[PDB]
Design a protein around this motif. Structure first.
Motif, PDB file in Angstrom:
ATOM      1  N   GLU A 116      27.355   7.341  26.489  1.00  0.00           N
ATOM      2  CA  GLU A 116      27.219   7.182  25.219  1.00  0.00           C
ATOM      3  C   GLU A 116      27.108   5.643  24.957  1.00  0.00           C
ATOM      4  OE1 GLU A 116      29.946   8.728  22.304  1.00  0.00           O
ATOM      5  OE2 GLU A 116      28.695   8.186  20.673  1.00  0.00           O
ATOM      6  N   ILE A 117      26.022   5.025  24.568  1.00  0.00           N
ATOM      7  CA  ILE A 117      26.083   3.947  24.073  1.00  0.00           C
ATOM      8  C   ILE A 117      26.562   3.472  22.666  1.00  0.00           C
ATOM      9  CG2 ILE A 117      24.117   1.923  23.217  1.00  0.00           C
ATOM     10  CD1 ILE A 117      22.274   3.141  25.482  1.00  0.00           C
ATOM     11  N   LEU A 118      27.257   2.596  22.526  1.00  0.00           N
ATOM     12  CA  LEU A 118      27.983   2.119  21.316  1.00  0.00           C
ATOM     13  C   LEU A 118      27.674   0.720  20.900  1.00  0.00           C
ATOM     14  CD1 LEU A 118      31.680   3.031  22.094  1.00  0.00           C
ATOM     15  CD2 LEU A 118      29.960   4.576  21.100  1.00  0.00           C
ATOM     16  N   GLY A 119      27.715   0.412  19.556  1.00  0.00           N
ATOM     17  CA  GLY A 119      27.505  -0.910  19.081  1.00  0.00           C
ATOM     18  C   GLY A 119      26.035  -1.117  18.511  1.00  0.00           C
ATOM     19  N   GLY A 120      25.670  -2.199  18.398  1.00  0.00           N
ATOM     20  CA  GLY A 120      24.594  -2.633  17.403  1.00  0.00           C
ATOM     21  C   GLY A 120      23.257  -2.242  17.952  1.00  0.00           C
ATOM     22  N   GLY A 121      23.199  -2.038  19.225  1.00  0.00           N
ATOM     23  CA  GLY A 121      21.846  -1.624  19.828  1.00  0.00           C
ATOM     24  C   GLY A 121      21.850   0.040  20.026  1.00  0.00           C
ATOM     25  N   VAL A 155      22.460  -1.012  25.083  1.00  0.00           N
ATOM     26  CA  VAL A 155      23.449  -1.931  24.939  1.00  0.00           C
ATOM     27  C   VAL A 155      23.358  -3.178  24.668  1.00  0.00           C
ATOM     28  CG1 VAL A 155      25.793  -2.440  26.058  1.00  0.00           C
ATOM     29  CG2 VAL A 155      24.824  -0.183  26.897  1.00  0.00           C
ATOM     30  N   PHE A 156      23.683  -3.685  23.150  1.00  0.00           N
ATOM     31  CA  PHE A 156      23.380  -4.896  22.555  1.00  0.00           C
ATOM     32  C   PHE A 156      24.774  -5.787  23.049  1.00  0.00           C
ATOM     33  CE2 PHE A 156      19.522  -3.953  21.288  1.00  0.00           C
ATOM     34  CZ  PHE A 156      19.194  -4.399  20.104  1.00  0.00           C
ATOM     35  N   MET A 157      24.866  -6.317  24.149  1.00  0.00           N
ATOM     36  CA  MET A 157      25.950  -7.274  24.775  1.00  0.00           C
ATOM     37  C   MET A 157      26.469  -8.344  23.671  1.00  0.00           C
ATOM     38  SD  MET A 157      26.703  -5.898  27.520  1.00  0.00           S
ATOM     39  CE  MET A 157      27.758  -6.868  28.355  1.00  0.00           C
ATOM     40  N   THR A 158      25.802  -8.627  23.068  1.00  0.00           N
ATOM     41  CA  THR A 158      26.371  -9.794  21.790  1.00  0.00           C
ATOM     42  C   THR A 158      26.645  -8.946  20.555  1.00  0.00           C
ATOM     43  OG1 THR A 158      24.353 -10.722  21.099  1.00  0.00           O
ATOM     44  CG2 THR A 158      25.532 -11.578  23.188  1.00  0.00           C
ATOM     45  N   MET A 159      26.325  -7.793  20.130  1.00  0.00           N
ATOM     46  CA  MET A 159      26.447  -6.792  19.032  1.00  0.00           C
ATOM     47  C   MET A 159      27.684  -5.754  19.209  1.00  0.00           C
ATOM     48  SD  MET A 159      22.820  -7.214  16.819  1.00  0.00           S
ATOM     49  CE  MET A 159      23.773  -5.969  16.019  1.00  0.00           C
ATOM     50  N   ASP A 160      28.520  -5.937  19.820  1.00  0.00           N
ATOM     51  CA  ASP A 160      29.582  -5.047  20.064  1.00  0.00           C
ATOM     52  C   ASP A 160      29.235  -3.866  20.890  1.00  0.00           C
ATOM     53  OD1 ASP A 160      32.445  -4.200  19.766  1.00  0.00           O
ATOM     54  OD2 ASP A 160      31.821  -2.998  18.084  1.00  0.00           O
ATOM     55  N   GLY A 161      28.225  -4.033  21.787  1.00  0.00           N
ATOM     56  CA  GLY A 161      27.642  -3.142  22.646  1.00  0.00           C
ATOM     57  C   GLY A 161      28.584  -2.809  23.839  1.00  0.00           C
ATOM     58  N   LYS A 162      28.760  -1.543  24.002  1.00  0.00           N
ATOM     59  CA  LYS A 162      29.520  -1.124  25.584  1.00  0.00           C
ATOM     60  C   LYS A 162      28.972   0.184  26.018  1.00  0.00           C
ATOM     61  CE  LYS A 162      32.318  -0.760  21.997  1.00  0.00           C
ATOM     62  NZ  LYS A 162      32.560  -1.862  21.130  1.00  0.00           N
ATOM     63  N   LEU A 163      29.219   0.547  26.809  1.00  0.00           N
ATOM     64  CA  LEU A 163      28.850   1.969  27.634  1.00  0.00           C
ATOM     65  C   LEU A 163      30.107   2.829  27.749  1.00  0.00           C
ATOM     66  CD1 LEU A 163      26.213   3.569  28.761  1.00  0.00           C
ATOM     67  CD2 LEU A 163      27.047   2.639  30.927  1.00  0.00           C
ATOM     68  N   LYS A 164      30.230   3.860  26.982  1.00  0.00           N
ATOM     69  CA  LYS A 164      31.337   4.830  27.042  1.00  0.00           C
ATOM     70  C   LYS A 164      30.946   5.910  27.923  1.00  0.00           C
ATOM     71  CE  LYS A 164      33.834   7.795  24.069  1.00  0.00           C
ATOM     72  NZ  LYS A 164      34.236   7.786  22.602  1.00  0.00           N
ATOM     73  N   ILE A 165      31.849   6.275  28.930  1.00  0.00           N
ATOM     74  CA  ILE A 165      31.827   7.060  30.060  1.00  0.00           C
ATOM     75  C   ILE A 165      32.755   8.167  29.307  1.00  0.00           C
ATOM     76  CG2 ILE A 165      32.095   7.783  32.388  1.00  0.00           C
ATOM     77  CD1 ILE A 165      31.674   4.793  32.913  1.00  0.00           C
ATOM     78  N   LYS A 166      32.207   9.504  29.557  1.00  0.00           N
ATOM     79  CA  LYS A 166      32.959  10.653  28.919  1.00  0.00           C
ATOM     80  C   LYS A 166      33.000  11.711  29.963  1.00  0.00           C
ATOM     81  CE  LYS A 166      29.997  10.880  25.245  1.00  0.00           C
ATOM     82  NZ  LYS A 166      29.659  11.270  24.043  1.00  0.00           N
TER      83      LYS A 166
END
Length: 392
Positions: free
Chosen positions: A18-23, A29-40
């Motif tokens: 799941e992609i999180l953050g501004g993108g 994944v917007f790396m400068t807008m709180d982006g991260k990749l969640k692994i579930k």
């Protein structure tokens, strides 16, 4: 070597990203807008798995658990009531997490659960804005891959900067100057922060680019191949900011790599800012700035702790079994007292534990005591727990 078997083949898992953050609304994944990749990960565990067996998650070539804060770690995995199912450990050398089953699997059948992890790309491999990366991991011996687009929002502008990573003691902060390659004179850059400070010019390195290829989008440039300035003019200001005087740069591009110190007993939101003042290609004063923010998540910046103690007959008590438990009573580790009566447990994540001293038959402690087990509470925060034994 091992506390048990590799039971990847006995842990049945389903994985999703799941992609999180501004993108997230742009599928990036917007790396400068709180982006991260969640692994579930949802899993079930075969009944034949025992305490000390383990499964693994290999994070592959492109990503690691954790995001901006080092050192990277994984978490233990728990059931719905917080009982520890497996202890999580991460090996940076192999980019692999190991989940070692506690005695949960010997108490319960039909063991199942879910867990999740936040992850970030290696910035030296995911280098380029809009790069579509085949993020392939292996969960309990089974590959899972999905293409994931990462974007750092590098722009061809006078000044842009980003926080490469953060540790308990310092951040690495990257500032790119004059990517637009305009003619500039009287060029100066002030690096300032909230939650950070400079103490020495040694904390700042300056590099001139040969061409724009060296302005890596991920803001983790290949410094080994960049031209480093020998005599950079750097002043540490009384407010703890730093000013870098690049002088009359003309159309040249510059990279400043800085390592501002974290402030002791600061929390909330850190900010690192690059302020670029210059005279432009039309002989006009100009000023441009860029800021980045970062959460001081103490739990992600903390080192691991440990504790120990002595056991004696109230003469050292050698070879006494001591278990480390979670607060729910699940066993996380075992040891014995050595010849001097000492035991310890280290590499413990901050939190609450129980220490269980197993009484020799006929002895009681000199906390609670039940069925020949003396149990003491311990709080770990990156101390000593002793036990005296007396006849019953």
């Amino acid at each position: 070597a091992q506390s048990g078997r590799n039971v990847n083949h006995l842990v049945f898992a389903n994985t999703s990203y799941e992609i999180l953050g501004g993108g997230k609304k742009y599928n990036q994944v917007f790396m400068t807008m709180d982006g991260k990749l969640k692994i579930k990960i949802d899993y079930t565990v075969d009944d034949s798995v025992v305490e000390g067996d383990y499964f693994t998650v290999d994070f592959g070539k492109y990503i690691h658990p954790g995001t901006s804060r080092k050192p990277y770690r994984v978490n233990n995995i728990h059931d719905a009531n917080g009982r520890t199912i497996a202890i999580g450990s991460y090996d940076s050398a192999t980019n692999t997490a190991k989940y070692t089953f506690t005695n949960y699997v010997d108490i319960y059948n039909n063991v199942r659960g879910s867990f999740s992890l936040l992850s970030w790309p290696f910035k030296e491999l995911v280098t380029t804005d809009k790069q579509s990366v085949p993020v392939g991991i292996t969960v309990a011996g089974e590959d899972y891959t999905q293409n994931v687009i990462f974007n750092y929002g590098n722009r061809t502008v006078p000044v842009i900067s980003d926080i490469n990573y953060l540790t308990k003691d310092f951040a690495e902060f990257t500032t790119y100057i004059n990517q637009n390659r305009a003619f500039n004179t009287g060029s100066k850059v002030r690096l300032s922060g909230q939650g950070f400070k400079f103490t020495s010019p040694d904390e700042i390195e300056v590099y001139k680019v040969l061409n724009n290829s060296q302005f890596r989008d991920s803001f983790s440039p290949d410094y080994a191949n960049l031209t480093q300035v020998r005599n950079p003019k750097i002043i540490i200001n009384s407010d703890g900011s730093a000013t870098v005087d690049l002088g009359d740069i003309g159309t040249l591009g510059y990279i400043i790599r800085s390592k501002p110190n974290t402030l002791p007993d600061f929390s909330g939101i850190g900010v690192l800012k690059s302020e670029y003042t210059f005279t432009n290609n039309k002989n006009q004063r100009d000023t441009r700035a860029h800021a980045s923010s970062i959460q001081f998540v103490r739990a992600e910046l903390a080192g691991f702790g440990g504790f120990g103690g002595y056991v004696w007959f109230d003469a050292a008590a050698a070879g006494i079994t001591v278990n480390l438990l979670d607060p729910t009573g699940i066993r996380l580790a075992t040891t014995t007292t050595d010849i001097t009566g000492h035991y310890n447990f280290d590499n413990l994540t901050n939190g609450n534990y129980l220490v269980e001293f197993v009484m020799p038959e006929g002895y009681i402690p000199t906390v609670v005591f039940e069925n020949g087990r003396y149990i003491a509470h311990v709080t770990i925060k990156d101390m000593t727990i002793d036990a005296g034994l007396v006849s019953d």
